[PDB]
Amino acid sequence: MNGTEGPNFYVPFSNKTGVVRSPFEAPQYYLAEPWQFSMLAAYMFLLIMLGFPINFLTLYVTVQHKKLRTPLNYILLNLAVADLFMVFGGFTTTLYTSLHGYFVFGPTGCNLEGFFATLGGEIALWSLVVLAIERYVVVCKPMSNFRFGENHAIMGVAFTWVMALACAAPPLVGWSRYIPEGMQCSCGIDYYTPHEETNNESFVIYMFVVHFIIPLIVIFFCYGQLVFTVKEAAAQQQESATTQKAEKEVTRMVIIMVIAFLICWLPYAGVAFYIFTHQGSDFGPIFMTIPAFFAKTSAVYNPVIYIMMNKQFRNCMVTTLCCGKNPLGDDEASTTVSKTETSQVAPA
Ligand SMILES: *[C@@H]1O[C@H](CO)[C@@H](O[C@@H]2O[C@H](CO)[C@@H](O[C@@H]3O[C@H](CO)[C@@H](O)[C@H](O)[C@@H]3O)[C@H](O)[C@H]2NC(C)=O)[C@H](O)[C@H]1NC(C)=O
Ligand SMILES: *[C@@H]1O[C@H](CO)[C@@H](O[C@@H]2O[C@H](CO)[C@@H](O)[C@H](O)[C@H]2NC(C)=O)[C@H](O)[C@H]1NC(C)=O
Ligand SMILES: *C/C=C(C)/C=C\C=C(C)\C=C\C1=C(C)CCCC1(C)C
Ligand SMILES: CCCCCCCS[C@@H]1O[C@H](CO)[C@@H](O)[C@H](O)[C@H]1O
Ligand SMILES: CCCCCCCS[C@@H]1O[C@H](CO)[C@@H](O)[C@H](O)[C@H]1O
Ligand SMILES: *C(=O)CCCCCCCCCCCCCCC
Ligand SMILES: *C(=O)CCCCCCCCCCCCCCC
Ligand SMILES: C=CC/C=C/C=C/CCCCCCCCC
Ligand SMILES: CC(=O)/C=C/C1=C(C)CCCC1(C)C
Ligand SMILES: [Hg+2]
Ligand SMILES: [Hg+2]
Ligand SMILES: [Hg+2]
Ligand SMILES: [Zn+2]
Ligand SMILES: [Zn+2]
Ligand SMILES: [Zn+2]
Ligand SMILES: [Zn+2]
């Protein structure tokens, strides 16, 4: 056999030398150099140190500034929240695991590690669908006099969680299961064994279709619409009203957010589809380790795109960090928001 199947795991190493141990009972240093596990640990340490403050700050500024209530401001607030669950929900265990070379917390630690990475990745995938919809409704404007309200945005947010939970929770209650991957310091969906006893195969097809292919189809089809209507081409203020030039900034960001999502999950998705379609083939530990741990960056890149591609939010963050206020130079050069500085309402 090319690997060592356990009743609870599947180590990507031969046990012909009888040196393979359950990833829930002993270190896996026989799979790789011990310094490489330290690498993983240092890496997770740094991700947590980056992920916590970046997402918390994003969360804090959105709340402290009353006028930050567009659908985009909601989705990113929702993302930072999801990202914080990733950091404290799963990254804390993946760091603890990497430090010991195996899941000392047994299957529970594996469920935490896998559930939160999945939840987070999916909340983002579905958040992209919503954003793609919202972006469609404002650019191609399917209605005549319509505008999304805080109510609709909260609906979208509630939606992403329902969809994400529909993908990450089944494995905690009998449909498929979370299992250690690569160097066995991270956990994911069981693509390794057929374990009919928990219907692993049907869940995988369900995950790749309902929670990967379909959403991407929607997203790319919707984009194909904003091919003619709007475009990445943006000049100075106006074009068709300054409300058009500013509307373009948000769309440019949403498109980048998709590029990033793909760059972060296509390799993990790719190696997972392979394994699933080559169960028992001869692949080693590093195979899934690299894409799996790289995908964990999904917990901090969104807020970075937000702050770097949204003049308004960035100015609000500066105003928050510089205490009282003092946005210096630009300030925004457009409408702004906060809790007492200049959140003055400006309708009619
Ligand atoms: C890879 O092959 C080796 C050798 O066949 C497997 O080692 C065996 O592992 C089991 C469980 O870890 C050992 O059983 C132990 O028996 C004592 C009874 O004295 C019990 O108190 C312990 O709780 C445990 O059940 C067994 O002795 C050991 N045999 C060896 C080293 O020759 C190893 O499990 C295989 N890797 C897999 C399939 O994960
Ligand atoms: C162990 O892994 C090897 C290589 O991944 C598997 O051998 C391949 O099997 C497929 C389908 O049977 C063939 O198309 C390839 O040509 C084989 N490659 C080799 C080794 O030349 C092998 O089947 C696996 N053993 C199992 C299933 O336990
Ligand atoms: C480090 C931990 C990881 C990567 C844990 C598990 C993650 C998954 C099973 C993620 C699945 C998928 C997502 C989030 C994005 C679209 C493709 C997908 C279905 C492979
Ligand atoms: C970017 C998505 C990644 C696509 C997945 C490529 C699987 S490729 C696969 O990998 C095995 C293990 O290293 C090799 O032994 C085998 O020769 C190779 O063809
Ligand atoms: C860190 C993610 C950002 C890097 C990806 C390239 C985004 S693109 C970049 O966005 C700026 C603000 O929206 C625009 O002013 C600029 O013209 C445009 O090229
Ligand atoms: C205004 O006074 C000048 C800008 C100074 C901002 C310095 C940037 C440091 C960012 C640290 C924020 C940490 C977030 C807190 C998480 C608890
Ligand atoms: C409100 O306006 C406070 C600003 C918060 C930004 C944090 C700025 C940190 C101050 C610089 C510290 C200098 C480093 C010296 C270390 C000995
Ligand atoms: C088109 C791409 C937009 C890309 C954006 C990226 C923003 C990224 C943050 C990634 C943080 C990784 C940290 C590793 C610390 C060892
Ligand atoms: C795919 C990848 O980046 C590395 C693949 C591998 C190498 C180089 C060494 C042993 C086996 C494994 C883990 C398959
Ligand atoms: Hg779109
Ligand atoms: Hg990424
Ligand atoms: Hg602002
Ligand atoms: Zn079983
Ligand atoms: Zn989902
Ligand atoms: Zn199969
Ligand atoms: Zn500026």
XYZ file of N, CA and C in Angstrom, residues 49-182:
402
model
N -0.466 36.474 14.471
C -0.039 37.806 14.866
C -0.471 38.839 13.822
N -0.615 38.433 12.563
C -1.052 39.347 11.488
C -2.558 39.348 11.413
N -3.139 38.153 11.419
C -4.576 38.009 11.325
C -5.426 38.634 12.414
N -5.017 38.506 13.673
C -5.821 39.056 14.766
C -5.977 40.561 14.681
N -4.878 41.318 14.829
C -4.996 42.778 14.763
C -5.554 43.358 13.472
N -5.250 42.757 12.326
C -5.739 43.281 11.050
C -7.237 43.135 10.943
N -7.768 42.003 11.382
C -9.204 41.767 11.299
C -9.935 42.484 12.403
N -9.388 42.479 13.615
C -10.035 43.171 14.717
C -10.145 44.653 14.395
N -9.067 45.242 13.879
C -9.048 46.660 13.521
C -10.098 46.929 12.462
N -10.203 46.053 11.465
C -11.196 46.214 10.400
C -12.581 46.175 11.007
N -12.755 45.316 12.001
C -14.031 45.151 12.693
C -14.364 46.401 13.486
N -13.371 46.908 14.201
C -13.513 48.078 15.054
C -13.850 49.344 14.261
N -13.114 49.628 13.196
C -13.379 50.829 12.426
C -14.775 50.795 11.808
N -15.203 49.644 11.299
C -16.526 49.571 10.673
C -17.615 49.907 11.685
N -17.474 49.423 12.913
C -18.483 49.678 13.939
C -18.433 51.116 14.435
N -17.239 51.625 14.720
C -17.085 52.987 15.235
C -17.574 54.047 14.257
N -17.691 53.740 12.970
C -18.109 54.761 12.000
C -19.495 54.501 11.430
N -20.489 55.158 12.025
C -21.918 55.040 11.669
C -22.214 55.019 10.175
N -21.610 55.904 9.391
C -21.913 55.969 7.954
C -21.290 54.845 7.136
N -20.503 53.965 7.745
C -19.930 52.840 6.990
C -20.961 51.733 6.999
N -22.009 51.879 6.192
C -23.070 50.879 6.185
C -23.511 50.447 4.785
N -22.609 50.486 3.808
C -22.946 50.039 2.458
C -22.938 48.520 2.494
N -23.367 47.848 1.410
C -23.340 46.383 1.459
C -21.893 45.901 1.523
N -20.990 46.659 0.909
C -19.572 46.314 0.899
C -19.014 46.387 2.305
N -19.397 47.415 3.060
C -18.907 47.579 4.425
C -19.421 46.454 5.301
N -20.573 45.881 4.959
C -21.143 44.776 5.746
C -20.389 43.488 5.457
N -20.219 43.179 4.179
C -19.531 41.967 3.760
C -18.131 41.895 4.336
N -17.408 43.009 4.361
C -16.054 42.988 4.896
C -16.068 42.907 6.402
N -17.090 43.456 7.038
C -17.179 43.328 8.483
C -17.370 41.845 8.762
N -18.254 41.232 7.984
C -18.565 39.810 8.096
C -17.300 38.990 7.853
N -16.498 39.371 6.860
C -15.253 38.658 6.545
C -14.273 38.728 7.700
N -14.070 39.910 8.269
C -13.139 40.054 9.393
C -13.599 39.176 10.531
N -14.905 39.097 10.734
C -15.433 38.269 11.802
C -15.060 36.813 11.529
N -15.328 36.356 10.312
C -15.031 34.991 9.914
C -13.551 34.739 10.063
N -12.749 35.729 9.678
C -11.294 35.610 9.765
C -10.857 35.467 11.217
N -11.504 36.177 12.137
C -11.142 36.080 13.559
C -11.473 34.691 14.100
N -12.545 34.067 13.611
C -12.902 32.696 14.037
C -11.848 31.749 13.489
N -11.308 32.065 12.318
C -10.261 31.232 11.737
C -9.030 31.315 12.620
N -8.612 32.536 12.937
C -7.440 32.755 13.763
C -7.569 32.089 15.130
N -8.630 32.392 15.872
C -8.788 31.829 17.220
C -9.449 30.484 17.202
N -10.323 30.249 16.234
C -11.008 28.971 16.173
C -10.141 27.816 15.719
N -9.409 28.008 14.624
C -8.581 26.937 14.110
C -7.081 27.120 14.146
N -6.598 28.316 13.822
C -5.154 28.587 13.785
C -4.481 28.337 15.120
N -5.209 28.522 16.212
C -4.633 28.295 17.522
C -4.301 26.810 17.660
N -5.133 25.946 17.094
C -4.890 24.511 17.171
C -3.850 24.095 16.141
N -3.901 24.653 14.932
C -2.924 24.265 13.924
C -1.525 24.661 14.400
N -1.419 25.724 15.194
C -0.115 26.145 15.730
C 0.298 25.201 16.849
N -0.668 24.810 17.664
C -0.402 23.915 18.768
C -0.011 22.561 18.231
N -0.662 22.138 17.153
C -0.402 20.836 16.533
C 0.971 20.808 15.918
N 1.262 21.802 15.090
C 2.548 21.901 14.431
C 3.659 21.880 15.448
N 3.442 22.505 16.603
C 4.472 22.561 17.647
C 4.776 21.190 18.197
N 3.821 20.266 18.138
C 4.031 18.919 18.680
C 4.171 17.884 17.591
N 4.034 18.284 16.330
C 4.162 17.325 15.248
C 2.986 16.378 15.073
N 1.827 16.722 15.639
C 0.604 15.892 15.515
C -0.519 16.506 16.331
N -1.735 16.030 16.114
C -2.905 16.537 16.814
C -2.989 15.975 18.212
N -2.354 16.630 19.180
C -2.420 16.130 20.548
C -3.860 16.198 21.032
N -4.648 17.136 20.518
C -6.050 17.248 20.949
C -6.922 16.219 20.258
N -6.312 15.206 19.652
C -7.101 14.180 18.992
C -8.099 14.686 17.960
N -9.084 13.857 17.582
C -10.082 14.272 16.586
C -10.795 15.586 16.841
N -10.860 16.024 18.093
C -11.524 17.295 18.394
C -10.691 18.434 17.823
N -9.380 18.395 18.057
C -8.509 19.425 17.527
C -8.585 19.456 16.011
N -8.748 18.282 15.403
C -8.839 18.145 13.942
C -10.108 18.775 13.438
N -11.190 18.636 14.199
C -12.463 19.210 13.792
C -12.407 20.713 13.881
N -11.785 21.237 14.934
C -11.655 22.689 15.097
C -10.846 23.256 13.942
N -9.675 22.671 13.692
C -8.755 23.092 12.622
C -9.456 23.086 11.268
N -10.127 21.981 10.936
C -10.794 21.871 9.654
C -12.081 22.655 9.514
N -12.904 22.632 10.553
C -14.178 23.327 10.508
C -13.980 24.811 10.299
N -13.065 25.419 11.039
C -12.887 26.863 10.924
C -12.212 27.309 9.647
N -11.332 26.500 9.076
C -10.692 26.912 7.836
C -11.716 26.833 6.735
N -12.542 25.792 6.778
C -13.578 25.589 5.775
C -14.600 26.706 5.902
N -15.125 26.893 7.109
C -16.105 27.941 7.375
C -15.606 29.247 6.788
N -14.399 29.645 7.170
C -13.838 30.894 6.690
C -13.690 30.993 5.189
N -13.150 29.945 4.576
C -12.968 29.955 3.138
C -14.287 30.035 2.390
N -15.294 29.324 2.895
C -16.613 29.296 2.273
C -17.376 30.581 2.543
N -17.267 31.140 3.743
C -17.959 32.394 4.018
C -17.461 33.428 3.017
N -16.189 33.328 2.646
C -15.606 34.264 1.691
C -16.092 33.957 0.293
N -16.159 32.677 -0.066
C -16.609 32.299 -1.410
C -18.023 32.779 -1.608
N -18.876 32.546 -0.621
C -20.254 32.967 -0.744
C -20.377 34.465 -0.629
N -19.509 35.105 0.154
C -19.558 36.562 0.272
C -19.279 37.144 -1.086
N -18.451 36.463 -1.882
C -18.116 36.933 -3.239
C -19.344 36.862 -4.131
N -20.169 35.834 -3.947
C -21.396 35.684 -4.728
C -22.270 36.890 -4.456
N -22.524 37.158 -3.178
C -23.348 38.292 -2.773
C -22.812 39.555 -3.422
N -21.535 39.835 -3.193
C -20.880 41.017 -3.745
C -21.092 41.072 -5.249
N -20.973 39.930 -5.921
C -21.150 39.872 -7.375
C -22.571 40.250 -7.738
N -23.539 39.811 -6.932
C -24.955 40.128 -7.152
C -25.141 41.628 -6.974
N -24.808 42.117 -5.783
C -24.915 43.540 -5.434
C -24.243 44.382 -6.496
N -23.065 43.964 -6.934
C -22.348 44.731 -7.932
C -23.131 44.737 -9.238
N -23.846 43.650 -9.514
C -24.631 43.548 -10.745
C -25.815 44.476 -10.662
N -26.481 44.469 -9.519
C -27.656 45.286 -9.312
C -27.359 46.778 -9.355
N -26.119 47.208 -9.138
C -25.861 48.652 -9.160
C -25.265 49.093 -10.471
N -24.551 48.208 -11.155
C -23.941 48.582 -12.424
C -24.932 48.423 -13.555
N -25.390 47.200 -13.800
C -26.358 46.954 -14.867
C -27.723 47.434 -14.415
N -27.842 47.666 -13.112
C -29.066 48.148 -12.468
C -30.312 47.530 -13.071
N -30.619 46.269 -12.715
C -31.791 45.541 -13.210
C -33.120 46.227 -12.923
N -33.155 47.106 -11.926
C -34.386 47.831 -11.591
C -34.292 49.253 -12.105
N -35.271 50.082 -11.753
C -35.285 51.481 -12.184
C -34.884 52.354 -11.017
N -35.662 52.290 -9.944
C -35.382 53.072 -8.752
C -35.229 52.136 -7.568
N -34.119 51.401 -7.534
C -33.856 50.459 -6.444
C -32.505 50.721 -5.819
N -32.404 50.431 -4.526
C -31.171 50.623 -3.773
C -31.148 49.647 -2.608
N -30.033 48.941 -2.434
C -29.887 47.975 -1.338
C -29.880 48.704 -0.009
N -30.525 48.123 0.996
C -30.558 48.744 2.306
C -29.811 47.885 3.306
N -29.549 48.430 4.489
C -28.839 47.688 5.524
C -29.529 46.377 5.760
N -30.836 46.353 5.541
C -31.613 45.140 5.731
C -31.148 44.084 4.740
N -31.105 44.429 3.457
C -30.674 43.487 2.415
C -29.268 42.973 2.691
N -28.368 43.869 3.088
C -26.978 43.510 3.375
C -26.929 42.488 4.479
N -27.707 42.701 5.532
C -27.721 41.756 6.629
C -28.250 40.426 6.118
N -29.099 40.467 5.098
C -29.626 39.240 4.519
C -28.491 38.513 3.841
N -27.718 39.233 3.035
C -26.595 38.629 2.342
C -25.647 37.969 3.321
N -25.356 38.669 4.411
C -24.463 38.145 5.433
C -25.043 36.886 6.027
N -26.322 36.907 6.376
C -26.966 35.726 6.960
C -26.886 34.580 5.968
N -26.954 34.922 4.686
C -26.894 33.959 3.593
C -25.533 33.260 3.568
N -24.446 34.026 3.531
C -23.108 33.431 3.477
C -22.904 32.443 4.605
N -23.410 32.747 5.800
C -23.250 31.836 6.930
C -24.092 30.586 6.739
N -25.310 30.730 6.236
C -26.136 29.551 6.030
C -25.428 28.632 5.049
N -24.948 29.191 3.942
C -24.263 28.396 2.913
C -22.973 27.793 3.440
N -22.157 28.585 4.128
C -20.896 28.071 4.672
C -21.179 26.952 5.662
N -22.111 27.161 6.589
C -22.446 26.129 7.579
C -22.904 24.863 6.864
N -23.655 25.021 5.782
C -24.151 23.870 5.037
C -23.000 23.050 4.477
N -21.800 23.622 4.450
C -20.639 22.925 3.904
C -19.682 22.456 4.986
N -19.500 23.259 6.026
C -18.529 22.932 7.071
C -19.076 22.101 8.206
N -20.380 22.149 8.452
C -20.973 21.418 9.579
C -21.265 19.948 9.299
N -21.739 19.602 8.093
C -22.014 18.181 7.864
C -20.955 17.245 8.406
N -19.662 17.528 8.159
C -18.566 16.677 8.643
C -18.473 16.513 10.157
N -19.175 17.353 10.911
C -19.129 17.236 12.371
C -20.241 16.327 12.857
N -21.175 15.981 11.975
C -22.313 15.172 12.399
C -22.621 13.984 11.490
N -21.599 13.315 10.966
C -21.858 12.142 10.150
C -21.724 12.175 8.643
N -21.745 13.344 8.013
C -21.594 13.359 6.563
C -20.174 13.762 6.266
N -19.356 12.765 5.921
C -17.934 12.945 5.669
C -17.326 13.168 7.020
N -16.093 13.654 7.069
C -15.427 13.880 8.349
C -14.160 14.686 8.107
N -13.614 15.300 9.150
C -12.373 16.053 9.007
C -11.231 15.090 9.273
N -10.158 15.190 8.496
C -9.051 14.257 8.639
C -7.727 14.985 8.402
N -6.653 14.597 9.116
C -5.334 15.240 8.963
C -4.747 15.136 7.560
N -4.120 16.204 7.073
C -3.545 16.209 5.718
C -2.059 16.563 5.725
N -1.401 16.317 4.591
C 0.011 16.627 4.451
C 0.861 16.094 5.577
